[PDB]
Design a protein around this nucleic acid. Structure first.
Ligand SMILES: [Mn+2]
Ligand SMILES: [Mn+2]
Ligand SMILES: [Mn+2]
Ligand SMILES: [Mn+2]
Ligand SMILES: [Mn+2]
Ligand SMILES: [Mn+2]
Ligand SMILES: [Mn+2]
Ligand SMILES: [Mn+2]
Ligand SMILES: [Mn+2]
Lengths: 244, 238
DNA sequence: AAAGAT
DNA sequence: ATCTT
DNA sequence: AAAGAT
DNA sequence: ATCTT
């Protein structure tokens, strides 16, 4: 399928190639700095040609947001299936020690999931799938050789601020958790688990409808959530009682 | 001086090189996308070698945050004068024309000496902003090899760069809401280079943003702009 | 612009 | 967009 | 974690 | 970190 070919290609490219810097048209290379700020940009750019190639092999049109602040990173679809669009959003996080538990921020819970056309490239109801390509890497402190530029002939002598990159492709609802991913910017939080749990889809929601109802009615602060629900057990009790 | 040699190197480097992609150890190049995040990241990386080269010429050590979400992008200090650090932070914005930058929070280190800052705020003697401005600009969804560098399309054109003191270019209207950022003046590139700001002093700039309330409701009984802040001062800070 | 989006 | 305390 | 930092 | 509505 489009999905299995896509993760096979991302998994393969990740295994083979390592990104090591930004290059100028003049051929000068600038090394990579430390944060997920830098790495999240790098893994998203790494992913673009792969996603396009597989999408094309399958007959899909690939569209990135023409406007800033709009989800998703990539919209895929066949002209013949306008209402079966696929959203793919790339998310990244890090670990300090290889293999510990990780969590991702999955985007807002008060934009398009509550307003069909808010901050999304096509109306929400035109999408039938929302996939997350998740990247995890282990941090490696920057070295005092990262601060010089390099020429192409030194490509593999460039130090990297990361190691152990892993990648997965999973449905957003499947890896969504029940605790916010951020406060002031109201993000859905994924489960906090091991990389394999994301691959296997060991999340907390039983269905995509449950994930949506939960996040569509999740209040913004602990105060606002006090008489409602703050986690999945509380939400299921709240559902049991009649949404009260 | 360190400042003048840095302005000169930044201008020069920006003039000589145009960043066009990320490269893998295997030599494959991936083009740049248009997300805001992309340009912010690229200009910061681009500045790193320039800043370290000039700092070392001047005897300054350069330290980047060892912890994420901490200001500033670069901390400079001569070993002998540790209590005299220089903060340099990179900011970016776009054009198609007046521009404005978000200059960082007004509720972190300016209100709490050790909050989200690498070294105590009182150890810094200067806070500089390196501002990058560019003009925003297809199936650039494929990889390239070294022989094709010159054909890779870019999501930008006309990059300009300046270095100015943060207080000098700071404005009186928030640069963001929920992430409570100081907004810079809304002016032309030339005004940033020339330092044509609104605050009469660094003291005024800091006091203003240290007492700016977070919402209009709160601000409308105190101050919403520099004129109202000056009147608040006259009323006795109430 | 203020407020809230990625 | 994701991270710290 | 929640809340608020870059 | 900075953008949109
Ligand atoms: Mn993106
Ligand atoms: Mn993304
Ligand atoms: Mn953890
Ligand atoms: Mn919109
Ligand atoms: Mn596990
Ligand atoms: Mn930075
Ligand atoms: Mn910066
Ligand atoms: Mn700290
Ligand atoms: Mn002007």
């Amino acid at each position: 399928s489009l999905r299995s070919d896509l993760i096979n290609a991302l998994y393969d490219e990740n295994q083979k190639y390592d990104v090591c810097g930004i290059i100028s048209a003049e051929g000068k290379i600038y090394p990579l700095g430390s944060d997920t700020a830098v790495l999240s940009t790098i893994f998203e750019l790494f992913s673009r040609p792969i996603i396009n190639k597989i999408a094309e092999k399958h007959g899909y049109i690939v569209e990135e947001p023409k406007q800033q602040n709009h989800y998703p990173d990539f919209t895929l679809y066949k002209p013949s299936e306008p209402n079966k669009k696929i959203a793919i959003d790339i998310k990244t996080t890090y670990t300090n020690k290889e293999n510990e538990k990780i969590k991702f921020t999955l985007g807002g819970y008060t934009s398009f999931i509550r307003n069909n056309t808010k901050n999304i490239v096509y109306p929400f109801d035109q999408y039938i799938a929302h996939w997350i390509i998740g990247y995890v890497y282990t941090r490696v402190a920057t070295r005092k050789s990262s601060l010089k530029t390099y020429n192409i002939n030194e490509l593999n002598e460039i130090p990297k601020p990361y190691k152990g990159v892993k990648v997965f492709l999973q449905d957003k609802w499947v890896i969504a958790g029940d605790l916010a991913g951020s406060g002031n910017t109201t993000n859905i939080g994924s489960i906090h688990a091991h990389y394999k749990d994301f691959v296997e889809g060991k999340g907390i929601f039983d269905s995509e409808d449950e994930f949506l109802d939960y996040w569509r009615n999740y209040e913004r602060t602990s105060q606002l959530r006090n008489d409602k629900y703050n986690n999945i057990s509380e939400y299921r009790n709240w559902i049991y009682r009649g949404r009260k």
